[PDB]
Structures are given as structure tokens and as C-alpha cells.
Ligand binder design. Structure first.
Ligand code: COY
Ligand code: COY
Ligand SMILES: [K+]
Ligand SMILES: [K+]
Ligand SMILES: [K+]
Ligand SMILES: [K+]
Lengths: 137, 178, 551, 551, 137, 178
């Protein structure tokens, strides 16, 4: 697993950051950009990279930071508009409990976002108790 | 005094009335704004602004939050036009609209000590233009680097006091005239 | 009869400031309040059942979040049982290493660490801060705004700030629908001034995330958290929605930090009778719990609240120290006006400037304060010479440097030109050569030709409406003949691909070299150790304008 | 075309200050010069044969004085062998006791202790200073002067300054022949404000001693020493004439300290190629060697010299730290103008204000600077409210307090009325009721009626030539309706009989109680120990004008 | 031998401090000032008081301060004008060597000020070497 | 070049002159004062103030120290009237008197940037009036709290440079003035 000794990846192991697309950092050129050899998705960070960074975080003694990065790796699978939907659904008084549980089941089943699904499920029962659901205002 | 709750406020009909949503202490425990401009005069110019543009001006007292955005939001639900103006006792003001998240808005006036009665009328005016889906050019930006130095602590104390009149889950009240 | 002595005193700027006597019950007290809870914790089977007096049956959303994720439970009883006076001593002792303290402070409950730092005077706090700061090298962040949202000015100002040494720069909007313009302006110009400078555009949460998705920013900071549940709620979030947002930014490769700062809960009406410092500590632990690397705090926008009461400016340094003691990056404010007095605002800044923080200010205004759209910063462009002089006086690296008028003029000029090309390739409302020469020589927006708000805002809103992304900026740069800038722009996105700058305190310096707490390890152990201003950087700092050569 | 940004900067007050590139061969360098000597000592049969480079054959009077009397020869070899970095670490380590350090520092050579403090940053030096300060309780000293030598005004300004908190006050002359009036006016007004405040009248050395012999002063401070022999010579003294003078003051029961300060030797043309700090260290050891208890230093009147070059204000804090570290009372300057910038003078003052020294300033101007006869102080009467606000903001005891206009008017009035009675009783040129009223309500000499300086100077002269002593002032007060004040004057005269206030850092507080380093031993050991702002004194400092009760 | 436990003398042992002419601290009253029962000549610190303070300084770890106090004790016997003469004599270029040696002889034989005599002969010797005698400028 | 050294100055014999004593670089390596007033003009006005009062002005250059008190003392030793004026190249001026300690004086001008050509003449006038045993009222006080901030570093540099021309034991030179 990635260690502090492996950081920065860019300097020590740039070939580790090869996109899921399977093209390196060095591929990201103005010319390639111009010729459309590289395009907007091409510069999407990968879950692989975020898991690398999560391990370094851990190695660095920062477990919560690592955890954040693990959620992040999961969330790379969720489309931008869907990200915004779920963020907004977590804001006070936006959702019913069942609506939140549906979001969590979705994260788990469609995107295998296991950790994020548990996070949302957690939110759902505590929003019940602390009365931050739709109609609690 | 000048404000009379005339029962729970009902959903608006016509898309050409602007609600002025007022904090739970406006014109009651507090009667003037952070710099002394009275509440009546402030309601005066806001209304006049709307009316003169040919739109109805409705006023309600907000209860479920003293936050200016949430009370504007309360009003935009009921405004037949979907346009509302939220106002705190200290004077902070916001023009809101249905479909916008509460911390978004059409126009914000986030330094109350800089507002004047003429500013309050332009706000009413603009609210009405928006209600006609007119797209008014925005009220000119007011800003002063020393506003917070001189008034933020007082703003705080005034907000603490108005906030004591918040009632969770309680629906806005409609209010009658001067 | 009036004393003329008192008449003279009455006229001084400082007496225009807002001062208040403490109001304990409404939490209008900066720190050391008798209502703050006694530190305590109970753990059963690895879960918190008691937190600072409160039973888990009574936890609000903030208690749950901190209890379940914000505290090092492995050493929490250990540290709870240690004397708070000893712990304070350890904090400022040069011979107790940062790596020996972090396991213990991160195991402290919010009330415990508040109790620890409250034993300290500001000299002790500063002594401690220089050790606890996560990045070995201090840095600086600027505001780049103007009351017109004029994009060519922002670009020029951005370029000048980067050149003076800011490693992060922040814009925001006089009129919110202008935002995409501001963002692109800031990015372009920042890259012109120094490639690697990080940029953000501060907006409502959902709006800002979307601009980041579109690639028009490189990080986000004004991701607000609050220290009481009713205030958080009026902030339209919970710890879980802000935690989700944090991870959303990281999932798009964007560095982010939260923002908090003493006095927000008072200002927003619900202190729950606690001191600003204690509620701020809750904010810092919320940040920790969320897995967020860093935090903007030190009252920030609420600075008129703790500054009004006794020991408020000491509480602000204390909240910055708690932040760094929790192994979080600290962007330590010094970015918002609280006083009409130069003496007073200088005393407030030196608390962070002297020891050094990850970002000594989290928004030095790189424009005159009339143009500052955060309602004024504690420093502005007119203080640049003073700031450099004080660096030289004290042999303190405050992250900035004296510059040459000719270089700044050049630099603002290529930035104005570049943004001009960009609007060109993108078919945005044109930036005339008139505008370019004016932004070149401007001090502020008073020196800029008025633009058509209507034609900019229309095209601005369309950039987000039609999801126009960063690539468009890059192409336009290339098309207009700014390949360098376009490359440099590409290189930011590249960093985004590697994830290295997501770590604690990361900035990007030199030839795209990340510099974070991970590879720029603060190793202070007293005099002659840790970061020391010296060599070429000291020579650079010594070279202020007007130094006459004696011979 | 010019940059409007640079045009605005060029107008800033800081760019009016004098700045200079280092001139190493001439010593125009604050500290850490490549020409400063490597620390060294050699001793043979109990006599030094080499000191910091120099062989005894080449010693000047300063080398001889220091090598024979300024260093604990019994431990000098031991301490020279210790690592200067560890010693610097000891200085700022809160757990290394002051009493464990003083035996080491007083055995160091001048170059050695300079080498030690030069490893430190200003945060470390402040951390060290709070501990090394001789008196547990920090204090403050003010100037009371006016451009007319108006004695009524001086008495009133002196009463106000004593009331505000100064424990020592200092006058000097616009017209030297006025001196005895100034001295008496200062003493009277000071005892009215707070019985116990000590007073001095700074003059030519023989002239000042004679004034003291006649009983019109409580102490002397501007007893100058210098760090090169040629400069000392142009100062019309040697280490031996100045040591004799020191003993002469003590033989009359008068408290005294020396004065030095970085940059004097540059200013006076002979730095012998050395840095300002190294030469100031020689001054500090001259003081120690002479057996003088305390020193006024921190550049003092030559502040424009170190401030002109890099790290000059850091050097100034360093010289203060060397002074305290060598177990001498430090009256730490902050008493002279060096800048047009409020920002810059605030940073210079906080170096001493935040840690606390024996006298945070050795001459805060208790008059508006137009009336300051030492050519301007770093703070003046118009800064009083700012000073009190910063005390409150940071919870720092700066020695002063907020005060009520009506108390100040009553106290200024009483001071004028007492002095009026003094002049009448002694047959001096009258003080009119009109002058009493003006002095009561004045801000400075612009508010005072003009006096007949011919008559004043003639009678002032006759005080000297007819040896009119201090008991004449006591009788006239007693005979003129001011028995209380007369008793207080008598009491401060009686202090001259015990020797008690001759000890390190002595001031006189409360009911004539001496407060010195001997009975007010600084016992700092980190957070929550040592002198702490608290209790009633904290309440007093919190109570600034304009602080509205929120409810 | 006085120690810091004996300080302040005014509080700890006021008796030890009895002046020039056998007046006590308490003899210095407004009333006695006014009747001239006490005068300036009575109000003079004694050599005994200063040697006590010298012992306290030594006990406080300040040997040179003590030595200063020991010199001062000797000088209490020297009249004000003679003090000023000798101070001025020590200033650069004022004196010849022989004049300094005679001040030194006089200190010793007239006032028993042996430490101050030694101090002045020391300056004479070094004033020759460093050329700060009359005629050397 | 407006000053010629014409031999070792001799002691004056009658109370009929004031000596003007100038530092060792006056009119030579330095030729204007700290704020650019020409040494030629300074010397002109002081001489005119003295002569104005019917007293002789006699000019010497001093070498044994560059300190203005010691400069003026060298001159008072040689002055027929016991009265002298010491002037450094940077402009600092003192009126001194045979009998006074070196660091005591009759009047001092310790902030050279504030001096004008009118001051220098007044200074000469006062010097003459002392010479004649009148008791002139002193030249009015010039003071400015920003003089050291603006000029002390420059004053130190000019003094360092003049001091290089000090010559221990070299007696003053009488000067012919062009
Ligand atoms: C102080 C301040 C606050 C603080 C107090 C708010 C409050 N509700 O009490 C603070 C920091 C908590 C805060 C939060 C927000 C949140 C909204 C929260 C809320 N419910 O109000 C916010 C949505 C940010 C977010 N990330 O969520 C928000 C924003 C975007 C803005 C902008 C609104 C733009 C618009 N909508 O058109 C804004 C104009 C800045 C800008 N240039 O973009 C500004 C008004 C921005 C202001 C800049 C500016 N141009 O004015 C600024 C800097 C100064 C205003 C002032 O002092 N006026 C003087 C005072 C005496 O007059 P007043 O009328 O009483 O002022 C009131 C109004 O400004 C009002 N108010 C303030 N912001 C705001 C926003 C909205 C939408 C509404 C309806 C009302 C709002 O509050 C004050 C006091 O009651 C300010 N804020 Co806020 C600035 C946020 C900056 C980053 C986060 N941050 C900074 N410090 C800290 C901290 N310690 N803790 C946590 N977070 C932060 N803000 N703010 N804010
Ligand atoms: C800076 C200064 C000095 C310093 C520089 C002196 C020098 N020769 O280079 C300093 C600290 C060494 C110094 C010493 C003394 C010695 C004289 C030494 C000497 N050979 O000149 C002194 C006798 C004290 C003593 N205990 O011996 C003395 C006195 C009495 C005075 C007063 C003269 C009264 C008078 N005669 O009518 C005086 C007016 C103050 C006062 N109100 O009493 C002032 C001029 C008093 C001044 C207050 C005032 N009202 O002006 C003040 C504060 C400001 C002058 C200035 O910056 N002008 C601006 C500058 C751009 O103009 P300039 O013309 O180039 O200025 C020159 C003259 O002022 C000249 N000069 C300065 N003092 C002085 C005195 C005499 C008699 C003459 C002929 C010429 C003198 O020096 C400067 C630089 O060349 C000043 N000084 Co001196 C005040 C000393 C205060 C306590 C000691 N002290 C403070 N800091 C330190 C230190 N770092 N080391 C050691 N000691 C001290 N001084 N000073 N000084
Ligand atoms: K907070
Ligand atoms: K910021
Ligand atoms: K010195
Ligand atoms: K002083």
C-alpha cells in the first residue's frame, strides 16, 4: 500500500497515476488537448488514485483524512448532477427518512458506494431524532 | 404601533403581488433599524415601491426562523408572483423567489447600516419588476469597509433579541396596514 | 469644562470601533466562560457515551459527529486524565515534538483542548503555533475582487498578487450572476503571475461545487460549519451534508477546506450560552471528523464579535492554535476588517504573522479595500510596503516580497491580454485594448472603464447553464497565442489528476512541485531549528524600495 | 505611464522613513555581522589574557573594564564550552528556571551571549523575555515634557500620567536653565497622581548629579555608556568615570541605571567595524561591571539607526533580552520615534509589550508628541486609548489603565494647585489661577498661557546657585494648604535613606512599599505560572470607554 | 550579615537604618521638618546602610551591585562638591596622572575610602595606556 | 573651494570676536548640510549675524574630534570673547562658552534638517550678543518628532564620513574665507 515515502506521486511514481483510460500524465498536452486526443473526461481523477492518496494519509497518521479520501474514491462513480442531488437531500428539512434510505440503497446498489451508503443511513436515523427532516421545521 | 396580524397567511393567487416577509420582532420589540430608520417608514417605501409599479404589496410576519433568507423563503412560498422581500428588524433585506435555494436570492442588502429610505423604495420597485418578470437592473451595490467595525457587534445584539421571538413550526401571519 | 486631552482622545479612530461588555448568558464572551462545560468523556466498547458532561442520549448532530469521528478514542481517556496545565506547557515547550503532541491533542475532547490552550498568554500561544503549524513553510492567501466584478481588473490584480507571493487567491462577486467570469479571470491571471497559484471563487455551496466541476477553480474554502445545531441549521447544512460535500470536492480532485471562526453563533443568535472559543472548538472538531484536511478560522467574517469583548483577539489566536494542534491546515484569517485603527489591526495580525501559519492571512486584500467584496480585509494593497518593511524589521517571513513597478506592470499587462484572448476565443463580451491598458495601470476599479453588466452577466450565466468548461479557456488561450498560460492551465488540472495537493496544507511551488505537510514536515525544536528565514529568501526580503546605499 | 498601484504606495507614510543597505565595514548592520568576533576567553592566574578575539595587549578601556569586572571568571571557561544553541534553547524553554540561567549568562563573554541570542527568532526571544525579566511585575515609564518648559503643565501632565499607571516619569528641558523648575514640577505632580512614582530630570551628567544632590529628583537614568572607546570618549566619559558616577548616586541614596542602545556608535562615527548588537553587548557588560542594577536600552534615542537596516527591530528585542538575561533591570525603550507608520511602530512596541519587561517603555510620551523634548516618542498621549484597547484585546498587562475624564481633571487640577502653592511659598514667579485652570484642561503647551521665561530661569538658576533643597518644597506645600502632598513628598525623600529602592528593578507602590526583583522575584515556569493578568487588575483593564453593556 | 530575608530594611529592620546624625526613620516627620528639628544634613544615607544593602545584593547573586554599594558607602564621607570634582577629574583629558594619584591618596588618607582609592589608581594606570589624560587629545 | 587654511589658529586677545569652529570636512569632502544648504551660504549667514552686532567673526577648522561639542570647545579655547559656534558638515550647530563643560552649552541646534539660512544668521547674532555680555533671548526652539525618522540614518552616514578626517592632536587651523 502507498506510503509517505511514495509521496508526492507525481515525482516518485507518476506511472502510478495512469488514468483508468490508461494514459499517463505526460499525455495531457496542449497539442493533445487541441487535437482532442485528450478531452474533459480524460482529466477525471480516478478512485484508484484517491485510494493511493488515502493510504498515504493513513501512513501520515491522518485516519479521518484517509476516510474522506475513501468516500471520495467511491463518489467518483456518481455523476455530477447526482452528487448535487444527494448533497441537497442531506440539507436540513429537505428529505423524508425513506427518501434518504433510498439514496443510500442507490449508492450501495448502483455505485457500490458502501461507505457513503452507510454514511447516509447514519444521517437518516439521526435526522429523525434531531428533527432535520422534511416537515420538521 | 402599525402592524396587525390578521390570521395565518394564505397562499397567493395572482402572479402580480409581492410579499414583504417581516421578522418576528419587526415593529414590535424592535421598531427601528440598526441606524434609526423606523419600521413604518421602511414598510412605507417598500410598499410604495411595489404599488407604484402596479403590483399588490402583501405583508406577513415570519416565525420559524429569524434568518433573513429563511423568512424571505417563507414569503416566496405564498407570493402569487413567487417573489418576496425578507426584512429583519435591524434592517437587513433580501429579494427572494421560489425555485431558488434559501441561501440564493435575486438581490441581497447585507450591510443594513448603508440602507436609506430611498434604498427601501428601490427594493420594493425592483421586487415588483421581478414579479412582472421584468428583469430590473439591480439596486446599486452598497459597501463600506468600516460597516462591520462600527456595527457588527450591534447587529449581533439586535439579532440575538429578535431571535427570541422565533417559533418553530409556526406559520407566517398576515398583517394589516398602518 | 472639557479636558482637551479627552477631546483629542475622543477623535481617535479606535473609538469608532464596536466594543461591548461581556454577556455571558448569550455567549457574548470570547473565552473562559463559566458556562463552558467541564471536559469529560466516557467510552464503552469503543463508542463515546459521554462527551464533556453531556450523555449520548442528549447528543445533538454536532456531538454525534465529533464523538463518532472527531476524536482519537485510543488515547482519549489517557489525555483526559492529564493535567491541562501540563499539556499547555507541552504545547509551547520547544523540546516536546509536534509528533509527540499530535496523538494526544487529537485525542482531546473539544472542552479539554479549549481548557488547555486557555491557560496560555499570547506569547506562549505563538511559541506553540510555530511548532504546531502543519506545513514547515508559512504561506499567504489573498482576496482578488472589485466592486464591479470587472474581469480584466481581476485578472491583472490576480497576476500582481501571485507575483508578490500569494500562493492561494480568492475571488467572489459583487453580483452573483457574474461568478463564472470572476473565476476564470482569477485562474488565468493567477497562472500568469505564478503558475501553481491556487484559486477559488466563493459562492453558495451548490453553486461553488458546480463551478469546480466545470474546472473554473482549483480549490474551495468557504465551506461553512457552525458550532451550535440551530446555527448550523440556519446555515442550511448539517455535519453530514458538509461531510458529503467535502468528499464530493475530493472525488473531483479539488483540494478543499472548511471555514468556521469564533463569534458566528452569537452573531447568528444561538450561542447556547457558551463562549465563542468553546463553540469554535466544536467547529474545528467537526472539520476533523469530516476528514477535511484544513480549516479557515480565526473569527474570519465575524471578527467584530470577539473583537468587541475582552481577550477576543487572544481567543482568535487560540482558535488558530487549536486548529493546528488538531493536525489541520490553518488558513488563519487576518482577512476581515474589525477596526478603524492601524495600531489595533496590526496587533491582531502579528499574532499569526510572527510565529507563522499555513496561511498567515486567509485573504489579505490584494486590491484597495474599497474594491474588497468581503466587506474589507484586515490588510489591503496599500499596506504592501508596510508589510514588507515589517518582514525586514523582524526577520520574519510573512510570505510576500518587495516587487518592481516595471515587473508588476508587465505582469498585469500579459494577464489582461491573456484574459482578452480568452474572451475572444470563447466569444464573450469583448475586452477592449482600452480596458487592457487600464487594468495594467489600475489601483482599483475606479481606474477602469465601465462595462456592460448586461452583456457580461448574460454570457456569465450561460457558461454554467450550458456547462462551458475549463478546456474552452485552455483552447482560447492556445488559439490567441498564450500557449504557455494554456500549458500552465493544463498543469493545474494535471495536479488535480494526481491527488497530491489534496493533502494537509498543500500548495504548488516552483516547477509544479507540491509543498504540503506530508513532504514539508515542520520539525521545530527551538532556536536554530525548524523553518528559518535565511539565504536568498532573506536577501529578497531585505530588498525593500527606498533603501539607500550608504557608501 | 505610471502604475496607479505604485503611486498610491509611494504616498504611504512608511516610505518617508530612512532605510539603508547594510554597510558592514562601518558597522551599519544591526546584528550577525561577519566582522563580529568569535566568542573566546583565556584566563591566566585569574586574569583574562584574551577576550572575544583580542589579546590583553590590545585591550581598550572597555575590554579592561569588562574583562576585570563584567564576567564571572570562575565559570567563564565552563560556559564558553557550552553549545550556544542549547543555551538559546534554555532561554526560551519554559521549564529551565531563570535562576538556572543567570549563573550561566553572567559567566558569558559579550560575544558569547550575542551568539546565543542570535540563534533566536523574535517569538523565541519574547518567550525568553517574559521569564528573564527581573521583576515579576512588568511596569511602565513616561516622559513628561513640553516645548515651553511650562512647570504648571508638567505638574498636571505628571499627575495624569501617574494616575494612568506610570511608575516612573522623566522630564528634560527645551531650555536647559529651566531644569530645576521642570524637576520640581515633575516631582510634585507625580506624587499628586500616585504617591510613590519615581522621577528623574535628564541633563548633562555633572549637572544632573548636582540636581539630585539638592533633592529635586528620585533617580537618574540617562547615565550614558557606549560600546567603543572613541565613542565613549566623545561622550565625555570612560567606564571608570561612569562607574564612579554610579557609586556617587548610590552614596546619596539615589536609585540609578545606565543608558545605552544599539546604533549609538554608528551614529557617533566609530563602530570599529562591528554590528550594533555586538557593540551594545559591550555596553550591557559595562553596566554589569560597574555594579549598576539596571539599564535603559533597546536603541533608545538612536532607533533610526538599527531600524534603517535588516533585522534592526529584532536586534532591539535581542539587546533587551541580553540585558535581562544578564540579570539587570531593563527599561526597554519604546520611547523614541523611528517611523511615520502606525503599523510599523506598533510591531516594534509589541516585542516588549507582549512578554512584559521591567519598564515596557522607558518613556511613553504622556504628552502629545509635539511637546516631547526627546524629539518624539514611539507612543504619545493620543495613543492612550489604543494602548488600553490592545491590553484588553490580548489580555496583556501593559502597565496602564483606562481612566475617567473627571478623575483626570480633578487630579491635574490638584497638581497645578499644589505647584501653585509651592511657587508662592518658595517666592518663585507666580502661578496664576488662570494658569491652574489651563493646566487642568490642557492637551499640551498650545493650551497654556505664555510665561515670563526670564523670571523663571533666573529663579530656577538661583535654586541651584543657592542650593535650595527638597525640604523647601515640602515646607511650602505643608505651609500652603497641602499637608497630604507634603507628607507624600517627605515620604519619597525618606526612601533615599534606606537603600531599599537601590536594588534591581525597584519601584515604589501602594503605601510606600518597595517593589523590586529582590522581593518580587519573577517565577515563570510556563502556562498558568508567573505573573498573570487576572482578578481586579484584569477587570480594570477590561473597563475601556465606549464598551456598552449589551443588555 | 544581611540577607534577602532581611529586605526590605524599611519593613524588616528600620532600626538598622538610622542616619548620618542618629535620626531614625520615624524622626522624619512633617512636624520636625517644619521646626527644623530635622534638616537636609540629617537626611543622608549612611555607610552602614549601604554596606547592609551590599550584603543583601550579594545574597541576591549580584556581586558587582554589592561592590558598587561598597564604593558608595565610602563616598558618603566625601562632600558633594568633592564628589563632583573627582567625577570630573575622571572624565577624558581632564587630569594628569599625578593629579589622579593625588585624588587617590586623598580618598584613602582623608576619607578611608580605600576601594575608591584603588579604583582611581586603576584608572590612572589605564588612562596612561589608553591616552585619556590631559594633553592626550 | 572657499576656505583656505592659513596656519595654526592663535588665542584671541580681546573680547571682540566670536570664533566659528567647523568640522574637519566642512567645505571640503562635504559642501552642503544634511538638507542641502551649501556650506558657503551657512558660513556667510553666521558671519553676517556676528558682524551685524559689531563683533569680529573668526573661522577655524577643527581636527581633534568631529563631535560638535568638542569642535566648539576647541574654538572657545581660542576665542577672544570666550564664545564660539561649532558647526558640523551635516549642519548641527552649537553656541559654546569657555568655562562650560564640553557637553553643556549656551544654545544648541540638535535637529539640523530644521535649520534655515535665517536660523544660522540668528545664531551668529546671538553668539555676538553673548560675546558682548548681553543676555540675548535664545533663538526659538525648532523641534519635529519626524526629524529622526526622516534623517537620523543620513545624519549617521554624513557623520561617519566627516569623522574620517579627524586627526588626534592636530590643533585647529585658521581659515581664510573666499
Ligand atoms: C458577516 C458575514 C457573514 C457571517 C454572518 C451571517 C449571518 N447570517 O449572521 C457568516 C460568516 C456566518 C456568513 C455566512 C454566509 C453564508 C449564509 C449563512 C446565513 N444564514 O446567513 C453564505 C451563504 C456562505 C456559505 N458558504 O454558506 C454567505 C454568503 C454567500 C455571503 C455573500 C452573499 C451573496 C449573495 N447572496 O448575493 C456576501 C455578500 C459575501 C460575498 N461577497 O459573496 C455576504 C453577505 C458576506 C458579507 C460581505 C458583504 N459584501 O457584505 C459579510 C462578510 C459581512 C456582512 C456584514 O458584516 N455587514 C454588516 C452588518 C452590521 O450589517 P448586517 O446587515 O447586519 O449584515 C448581515 C448580513 O450580511 C447577513 N448575511 C451575511 N452573509 C449572508 C448571506 C446571505 C445569503 C444572507 C441572506 C444574509 C447574509 O449577516 C450579517 C449579520 O446578520 C458576511 N457575509 Co456571508 C459570508 C460567508 C463567508 C465565508 C464563510 N465564513 C466566513 N466567516 C465564517 C465563520 N466565522 N464561520 C463560518 N463560515 C464563515 N456571512 N454568507 N455573505
Ligand atoms: C539622538 C540624540 C542623542 C544621541 C546622538 C548624539 C550624537 N552626538 O551623535 C545620543 C543618545 C548618543 C545622545 C547623547 C547625548 C549626550 C551628549 C553626547 C554627545 N557627544 O553628543 C547628552 C549630554 C546626554 C548624556 N547623558 O551625556 C545629550 C543631551 C543632554 C541631549 C540634549 C541637549 C540639551 C542641551 N545641551 O541644550 C537634548 C536636546 C535632549 C534634551 N532635551 O535634553 C539632545 C540633543 C537629544 C535629542 C532630542 C532633541 N530635542 O533634539 C535627541 C534625542 C535627538 C536628536 C536628533 O536625532 N536630531 C535629528 C538629527 C537628524 O539631527 P542632527 O542635527 O544630526 O542631530 C544631532 C544632534 O542632536 C547631536 N546631539 C545629540 N545629543 C546632543 C547633546 C549635545 C550636548 C550636543 C552638543 C549635541 C547632541 O547628535 C545628533 C546626531 O549627530 C538626541 N539627543 Co542627546 C540625549 C541622550 C538621551 C539619553 C542618553 N541615551 C539615549 N539613547 C542612548 C544610547 N543609544 N546610548 C547611550 N546613551 C543614550 N543624544 N545627548 N541630547
Ligand atoms: K464558530
Ligand atoms: K479566504
Ligand atoms: K550602544
Ligand atoms: K527614559
Amino acid at each position: 500500500s502507498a506510503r509517505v515515502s511514495d509521496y508526492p506521486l507525481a515525482n516518485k511514481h507518476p506511472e502510478w497515476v495512469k488514468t483508468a483510460t490508461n494514459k499517463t500524465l505526460d499525455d495531457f498536452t496542449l497539442e493533445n488537448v487541441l487535437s482532442n486526443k485528450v478531452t474533459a473526461q480524460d482529466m477525471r481523477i480516478t478512485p484508484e488514485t484517491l485510494r493511493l492518496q488515502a493510504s498515504i494519509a493513513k501512513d501520515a497518521g491522518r485516519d479521518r483524512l484517509a476516510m474522506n479520501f475513501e468516500r471520495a474514491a467511491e463518489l467518483t462513480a456518481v455523476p455530477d448532477d447526482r452528487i448535487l442531488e444527494i448533497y441537497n437531500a442531506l440539507r436540513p428539512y429537505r428529505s423524508t427518512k425513506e427518501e434518504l434510505l433510498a439514496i443510500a440503497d442507490d449508492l450501495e446498489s448502483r455505485y457500490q458506494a458502501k461507505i457513503c451508503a452507510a454514511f447516509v443511513r447514519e444521517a437518516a436515523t439521526l435526522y429523525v431524532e434531531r428533527k432535520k427532516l422534511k416537515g420538521d421545521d | 404601533g402599525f402592524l396587525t396580524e390578521v390570521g395565518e397567511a394564505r397562499q397567493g393567487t395572482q402572479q402580480d403581488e409581492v410579499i414583504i416577509a417581516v421578522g418576528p420582532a419587526f415593529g414590535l420589540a424592535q421598531t427601528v433599524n440598526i441606524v434609526g430608520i423606523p419600521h413604518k417608514s421602511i414598510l412605507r417605501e417598500v410598499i410604495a415601491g411595489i404599488e407604484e409599479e402596479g403590483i399588490k404589496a402583501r405583508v406577513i410576519r415570519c416565525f420559524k426562523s429569524s434568518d433573513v433568507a429563511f423568512v424571505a423563503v417563507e414569503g416566496n412560498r405564498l407570493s402569487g408572483s413567487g417573489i418576496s422581500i425578507g426584512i429583519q428588524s435591524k434592517g437587513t433585506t433580501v429579494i427572494h423567489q421560489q425555485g431558488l435555494p434559501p441561501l440564493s436570492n435575486l438581490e441581497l442588502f447585507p450591510q443594513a447600516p448603508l440602507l436609506t429610505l430611498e434604498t427601501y423604495r428601490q427594493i420594493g420597485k425592483n421586487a415588483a419588476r421581478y414579479a412582472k418578470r421584468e428583469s430590473p437592473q439591480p439596486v446599486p451595490t452598497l459597501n463600506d469597509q468600516m460597516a462591520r467595525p462600527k456595527y457588527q457587534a450591534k447587529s449581533a445584539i439586535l439579532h440575538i433579541k429578535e431571535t427570541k421571538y422565533v417559533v418553530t413550526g409556526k406559520n407566517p401571519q398576515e398583517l394589516r396596514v398602518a | 469644562m472639557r479636558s482637551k486631552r479627552f477631546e483629542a482622545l475622543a477623535k481617535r479612530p479606535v473609538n469608532q470601533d464596536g466594543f461591548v461588555k461581556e454577556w455571558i448568558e448569550e455567549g457574548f464572551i470570547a473565552m473562559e466562560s463559566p458556562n463552558d462545560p467541564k471536559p469529560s468523556i466516557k467510552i464503552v466498547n469503543g463508542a463515546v457515551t459521554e462527551l464533556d458532561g453531556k450523555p449520548v442520549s442528549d447528543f445533538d448532530l454536532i456531538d454525534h459527529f465529533i464523538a463518532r469521528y472527531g476524536i482519537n478514542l485510543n488515547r482519549a481517556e489517557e489525555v483526559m486524565a492529564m493535567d491541562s496545565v501540563k499539556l499547555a506547557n507541552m504545547l509551547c515547550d520547544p523540546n516536546v515534538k509536534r509528533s509527540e503532541i499530535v496523538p494526544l491533542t487529537t485525542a482531546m475532547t473539544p472542552a479539554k483542548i479549549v481548557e488547555v490552550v486557555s491557560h496560555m498568554n499570547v506569547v506562549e500561544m505563538m511559541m506553540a503555533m510555530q511548532k504546531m503549524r502543519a506545513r514547515r513553510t508559512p504561506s499567504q492567501q489573498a482576496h482578488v475582487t472589485n466592486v464591479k466584478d470587472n474581469p480584466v481588473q481581476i485578472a491583472a490584480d490576480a497576476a500582481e498578487g501571485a507575483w508578490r507571493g500569494f500562493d492561494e487567491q480568492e475571488t467572489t462577486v459583487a453580483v452573483a450572476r457574474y461568478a463564472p467570469f470572476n473565476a476564470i479571470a482569477l485562474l488565468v491571471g493567477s497562472q500568469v503571475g505564478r503558475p501553481g497559484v491556487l484559486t477559488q471563487c466563493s459562492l453558495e455551496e451548490a453553486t461553488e461545487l458546480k463551478l469546480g466541476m466545470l474546472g473554473h477553480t482549483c480549490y474551495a474554502e468557504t465551506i461553512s460549519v457552525y458550532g451550535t445545531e440551530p446555527v448550523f441549521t440556519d446555515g442550511d447544512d448539517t455535519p453530514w451534508s458538509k461531510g458529503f460535500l467535502a468528499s464530493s470536492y475530493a472525488s473531483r480532485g479539488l483540494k478543499m477546506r472548511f471555514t468556521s471562526g469564533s463569534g458566528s453563533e452569537v452573531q447568528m443568535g444561538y450561542a447556547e450560552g457558551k463562549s465563542m472559543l468553546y463553540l469554535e472548538a466544536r467547529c474545528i472538531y467537526i472539520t476533523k471528523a469530516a476528514g477535511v484536511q484544513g480549516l479557515q478560522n480565526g473569527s474570519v467574517s465575524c471578527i467584530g464579535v470577539p473583537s468587541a469583548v475582552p481577550s477576543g483577539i487572544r481567543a482568535v489566536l487560540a482558535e488558530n492554535l487549536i486548529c493546528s494542534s488538531l493536525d489541520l491546515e490553518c488558513a488563519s484569517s487576518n482577512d476581515q476588517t474589525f477596526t478603524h485603527s492601524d495600531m489595533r489591526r496590526t496587533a491582531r495580525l502579528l499574532m499569526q504573522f510572527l510565529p507563522g501559519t499555513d496561511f498567515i492571512s486567509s485573504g489579505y486584500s490584494a486590491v484597495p479595500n474599497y474594491d474588497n467584496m468581503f466587506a474589507g480585509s484586515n490588510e489591503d494593497a496599500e499596506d504592501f510596503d508596510d508589510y514588507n518593511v515589517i518582514q525586514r524589521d523582524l526577520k520574519v517571513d510573512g510570505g510576500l516580497r518587495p516587487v518592481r513597478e516595471e515587473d508588476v506592470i508587465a505582469i498585469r499587462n500579459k494577464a489582461a491580454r491573456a484574459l482578452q484572448a480568452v474572451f475572444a476565443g470563447m466569444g464573450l463580451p469583448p475586452i477592449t485594448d482600452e480596458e487592457v491598458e487600464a487594468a495594467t495601470y489600475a489601483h482599483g476599479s475606479k481606474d477602469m472603464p465601465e462595462r456592460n453588466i448586461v452583456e457580461d452577466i448574460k454570457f456569465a450565466q450561460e457558461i454554467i447553464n450550458k456547462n462551458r468548461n475549463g478546456l474552452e479557456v485552455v483552447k482560447a488561450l492556445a488559439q490567441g497565442g498564450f500557449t504557455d498560460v494554456a500549458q500552465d492551465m493544463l498543469n493545474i488540472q494535471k495536479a488535480k489528476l494526481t491527488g497530491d495537493y489534496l493533502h494537509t496544507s498543500a500548495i504548488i511551488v516552483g516547477d509544479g512541485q507540491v509543498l504540503s505537510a506530508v513532504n514539508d514536515v515542520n520539525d521545530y525544536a527551538g532556536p536554530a531549528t525548524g523553518y528559518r528565514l535565511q539565504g536568498e529568501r532573506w536577501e529578497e526580503i531585505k530588498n525593500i524600495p527606498g533603501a539607500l546605499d550608504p557608501n
